[model samples]
Target: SNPIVDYEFNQDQSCLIVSTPKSFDIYNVHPLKRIMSQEMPDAGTIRMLHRTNYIAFVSTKKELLHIWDDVKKQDITRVKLDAAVKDLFLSREFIVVSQGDVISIFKFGNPWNKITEDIKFGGVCEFANGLLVYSNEFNLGQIHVTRLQTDAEQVVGKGVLVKAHANPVKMVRLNRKGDMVATCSQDGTLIRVFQTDNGVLVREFRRGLDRTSIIDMRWSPDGSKLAVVSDKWTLHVFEVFNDAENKRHVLKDWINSEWSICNFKLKVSKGSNDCKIAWISDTGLVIVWPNRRLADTFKLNYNDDEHVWWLQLNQRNEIP
Candidate 1:
């Protein structure tokens, strides 16, 4: 049997893409069923659009990117880039590829624009509702928020730089509406959210008091709360934009940084592994570990009387 190479969820968390050495499979997150599977040798990393039949696949050993129509089961086009690709994001309108120090945008298989930065190779990059948020530098711990504008031909934009952390940023994610950007630094103690429109630091959150590697961070569907998981073997849910209720008269954000309101220890079988997490509903979470072949669904109720560890593990080994 071939081992799993890559696994990711779509932008809206409605579907998942699992890649192996010679093929890939797409599964629906709601009912957890395999929807589509394609045979493609050396499929390295695959990205899918929101609940759509379109997908992008890059080879594990080649520099070619193949755009496929899963409905038609045919190749739409293939792009040959100049360097080895680091990351790829597929959206409704555009395809973003990060190769070396340059990030390229494609409208279909044709090249549209490129953003070149003097940064390290592999950092965080995300695309959402007509916007792009990515790290700008490795040392300065800066992030850039750019609004991608579409004309008759291609997409273009200007970016606003945000000085995020003292060290490099490890992860970055945009809200559903692309109005805000959440970031975590290499220190992994603090997670900050910034207004994309003006690059204003709006909320500061403390994931922990000591240093630990932040594994994953996700925004809720409404963007009202954020869920974070770390190598400390803990999952935390933090409040966002709910400042009026927890208002203090004269306190700085550093001293008054909000802590997680709800937390649970991740029950892994062995050492720490990578996780793929998403919000299924307002209060439900779906977490998957493709490498460890584990999947779980958690439904949380804040009532004090009920048992807190409400978890259900699903065994869908065929999909993985």
Candidate 2:
């Protein structure tokens, strides 16, 4: 009740996961109800299974890892981590638990066993399409992808290292697929997307010139665009290049690319909005702030060839 450390919206946006070290609560968006709640004793982390009712979380007081079904109000499977769990990732396929500098991956089914546990890492971690992506100060501005060796096709060792940012890395975010990762810094100037397979910097843009914080950045549902909010009082959206036939000459166009289709400010946020931005659609966006009422709908006509946007119709799409 005093403060919240983290929270997340379910895949359908029907409910939200609100957590503090004391309790984890799921509140239904409409009709405003607490559907499920658990008293998390030393709750380290909680992740919602985007499109499902399942959530993965760790409780140190009980020393158990739980995959819960909020609807069933039950733990589908519970495993004990030999060590304390610091961070956790949940997906339909597997679960990732991070303890200290090491992380372990486990299968989602019964008789769940270690897929890979030799990862030597520290910092933040997340999973994408079954791969565990890790980051920390040790590898500042860089993230490592560790894959599990399976019977079907045993791949190489230690995964891949992505040189993410020029400054110390602040956080690493992965798109729905395991292929794209967004790396930001404490300085909050640059945001870059790296190709997980080849460690290629496919897209790059500066958030701002001053030292600020990036509140949040997300890849759209289609993995073809990005939306972000910065402490600088603005929301920015960018186009993502998915084809290699494009990136061959994409960097040049990107280098000359304007920061975003919408580098617009949030003068309307005072109605209680802190200027959070979201891609309502790949080409359009919705700005929600703290107020009860959301921002009035807006539009942008982005030109792919010119790498620019039109905030108003019939005008030059440029400011005075």
Candidate 3:
């Protein structure tokens, strides 16, 4: 059984730690060597800072935030965020904490000193490019984007306050360049894309499938494709293209269904049992599942029993 709740790699991407309820095990990436095991009193959420050597774990009891040194293998400091922290994100300069209605921004040098607290609207919180964006749900399903600086000031930016959807927003993700943003609703029937700077509607695409609620959405590494998944076990992949002459954005090659379709509409040989998919790189994808063996069974292969059988036999030898 895998006891790891979550894991994150270090700055160099050469090592990572598997965070568990009892302890965390750090391992080297190349040969898979275990370097250290640090114990914790209680389990919670674990997040690693971007481009740094810091890791933070929030206690389940909601009492303290534990900080650790990745390179030195020691506990550096502990800050008490008594509020029930709903989410955590580590940016290049500060750590963003999302409580019920407020979003707190704290710097790495002084975790206790909250630089800013943007509590404009009561909705879910998301961070991108040092800005906090969330949907108010009430004001006609409006989405607000605000800049939170170190001086503790909330500067409201351009946003779209329209009655777009009936349900609340479930997931919001920004592209790599921070120019485009995509959001999905709890029912998964509708997906809205927006320009992050001024909040202009780029496109509104629908799943048009029954019993499907999107749980997650991710952009490709190259920002050329968008992937969305729903609870009804369906994955939608679209190719994003921009028209400069008309100043319009379009989603092409729309692949919609309950099947595992790739770039060329190639379904997974055994099909997908899970609804989670992520782009590992520009050309690779990483799919996860509750069953490890079933997840491991998928491999790039042709539709032939002899070739698949020979491939399975070869994998057995390579496993040892």
Candidate 4:
């Protein structure tokens, strides 16, 4: 048996996809049931399109990207680039590929546009609802939130800049609607949220004082809460500000910092030290240890009698 190579959720968080040297599989996130499976000739990173029959992947060779129509069991589109692919984002409207300092955009099966960043970046990029958010190649601690005109023959947008931190940015994630963007610096002690329209700093949450890498961050479907996972074997949930009562905290900077309302300590393993997370609803979330080929789902509850706690609903192993 081959080891796991990549694992992630679709854009809408309806399903999870796992890839290995021999094949890839897709499953429903809430009930932990396999819905689709396919064997591949080579190992690579694979992603599904929001529970649809369409799928995209970049193989270990890395220069070519392929889109498959699973209903027909054939490759419908293929495109090759100049260099190795550092990262990629797939949406219903478009697909984005990053190679060193350059980003190539493709619509359907055609090359739409290209953008050159100020520096070579290998971090994550989020593209949805015609908006794109990525680390600022020009400035280490800044990010660019640009709206793309995907309907046009030529994709174009001047990105709005946001100053997120003092040190280089380590991670960036955008809400589904592309209205809000969250970021963490290389220090990994604090997380900040910015409104994409004007790049205004709205809320700041403290993860921990001690430095630790943030594996992933995601906003609930309604954008009212955030779920975060880290290598510390901890999962945290924060309720975002929705009304004036919760927004009117003390003016002191330290008091303004919000902390997670709930958290869970996951059981440790000797497998890969990486983790990923996604939200199923406002009250439920899922966690996956990719290299370990394991996943679990939990529901959150709160009441006057108890502050907060999580209920494990399902757990599954991939290769066992």
Candidate 5:
């Protein structure tokens, strides 16, 4: 149980790829059965293909990377990175790699694919559609968004900046459709769900009264709900409105209410959780908390891994 560092669901939803400090396990979702497990002793981050059963792994030593075509049952790509591959974002079309202030977006198929030029940004970046959203790690709570050029040579324009958080944004997630974004500050006191187009604040929710850090957050598949994890030892899943929900609530963003469909405590230690959540289906939510808790007040872990979801149950042997 090395603690899960990162994970993703395969595009076809056939399996789940989980990463820990020691290795990556490709688990079939049919019964949570792990089919293939590869040792990634130096694994730092992981990115999976959106249309294929391929996955990329980067070593923290900033030197090595590997890609495995699970469908073909082979390791197809492996290369060394000149700079530490600090972070990566993969879309259906491109592999976005961020090395310090410079980013490289490229097509990855053959180990010898084309290397498009580097696009510069200040901090870590996430890719959705063609838009790249990045932040300034040094100063200023700025989240910038830009689209790559048609020729894949450069960014199209100066792009837009979202200055919603007062402190440095600890985490941000874009809706899959690219219309909305959810941003949280390191302070974890404020969580804002907003429009990506106009930079308008759609809704703001407070995580807690005291200072805490937001580990992760996500906008649901249909972009109607959001799930958040904070160091305050709490798990909150909120309802972010769509067109009709927004109109009916007068664009208040669950302001008049708690806005959360699920709210509970999920206590995980610093090195334990990766803050993962998703709408596995329209009616199913898959929340991977780092806690095998040792829970807030009750629970136990008999057959847990260093991966995710340390669920808590009452003395009654049920989720309290």
Candidate 6:
């Protein structure tokens, strides 16, 4: 089955969202039932805070930060930013907002209290643990990792700035241990992977096709595979092979699929965007194709569509 947008899941991974754009809905993935739905003011970019039951959205107007409660149904708070919010991060207790060249840190409980203000940033922000990493977007992609908890406020380590594709970085994510990070650029030519501990060059996976820019990249729950998507209406899966030493790594296989590729042309209401993927099971994938017309087209002629039928391959011609 195709994936649906605005879905929900419980802490144990059970439950599914039964309604679209509803205030809330719950389903059983197994023994647990969880709630899911939209809860914030409509905004441009939204992200789920890692390991925290919270979601943050940056306003396109650059006015305020919309923080919503994921476990409960409510808008918890709104924080005003000095400039338009370019990026945001929510830690266990603080919310970090990146506006232009300055980064602001605010505590969770008090919306008016500012923990840190006007902290200068050198480039794009990539954060994990108590560490905040950034690099100059225009210059060579030299990355600087800093510890936010330290009173000294110094660069803990630095690495050569990787040359991102012509387009700017659209998305960045770190693995469970924060030892590795993956970034996708506006230009789809490449997805850069880095070893955070030593700032070593791990690998670069290229999209190859022209004008195809990666819009998003996500790591599987087990951190064994990476899923990437581009504006060209394609999805890619890369297998991450780790050696026994846990130091060396390789890209074992590259898989491409286009099941929801054609949704780009569909004329839908304002809220629909076909740009989300969920793991149905360990090996099963559920990608959301939000355009109603596109979904209908898929239902009627799935086999005839090249993108819809193409999937990752397993042994003996089995599909996963």
lDDT of each: 0.77, 0.64, 0.57, 0.75, 0.63, 0.52
Model 4 bad stretches (over 4 Å): 110-124, 152-154, 242-257, 305-320
Q: Residue by residue across 105-211, what tens digits does model 3's lDDT show?
A: 67766554666545545456667666667767356256676555554334333344533356777667776666677777667777777776677777776665564
Among all windows of ten consecutive residues in candidate 6, which has the lowest summed lDDT?
Answer: 293-302
The predictions' CA RMSDs to the true structure, in order, are 4.4, 7.0, 7.3, 3.9, 7.5, 8.9
Clashing pairs in 6: 15-27, 15-29, 62-84, 141-161, 142-161, 188-213
Candidate 2 pairs with clashing backbones = 272-290, 272-291, 273-289, 273-290
Q: Residue-wise lDDT of candidate 4 within 129-230, one digit each (tens)?
A: 778777766677877788877555545676687878898888888887777788888787888989899989978999888888888899888787788877
Better of 1 and 6 by TM-score: 1
Q: Over the stretch 63-151, how does candidate 1's per-residue lDDT look in tens digits?
A: 88888887778878888787767788886667788776767877754453343322243366777777888787454488888877766
> TM-score for every candidate vs. truth?
0.86, 0.71, 0.71, 0.87, 0.74, 0.60
Q: Estimate the overall C-alpha local distance difference test score of candidate 1.
A: 0.77
User: What lDDT tens digits, residue by residue, belong to model 6 across residues 164-272?
Assistant: 4355665566755566777666565766777776656676766555756555565655665566666555566665533332444554553442112222222334654
Largest TM-score belongs to which candidate? 4
User: Candidate 4 — worst ten consecutive residues by lDDT sum?
Assistant: 112-121
List model 5 lDDT by residue over 1-320, tens digit each. 46666666654344566677888776554334567787767667787675467788886655766776777766677665667666776655667788766777666554445466666655656777777777855554777777665454453545777786778777778777777778877788878876777778888876668888777676656667677777776767676764478445555454643445456676455666454554554334444443441112223222436422233433211111
TM-score of 2: 0.71
Model 6 spans > 4 angstroms off: 1-62, 66-77, 110-112, 117-124, 135-142, 150-170, 209-211, 242-274, 278-282, 289-320
Q: Candidate 3 regions off by >4 Å?
A: 2-18, 25-38, 118-123, 151-164, 242-276, 290-320
Q: Tens-digit lDDT track for model 2 on 60-79?
A: 46777878877778888888
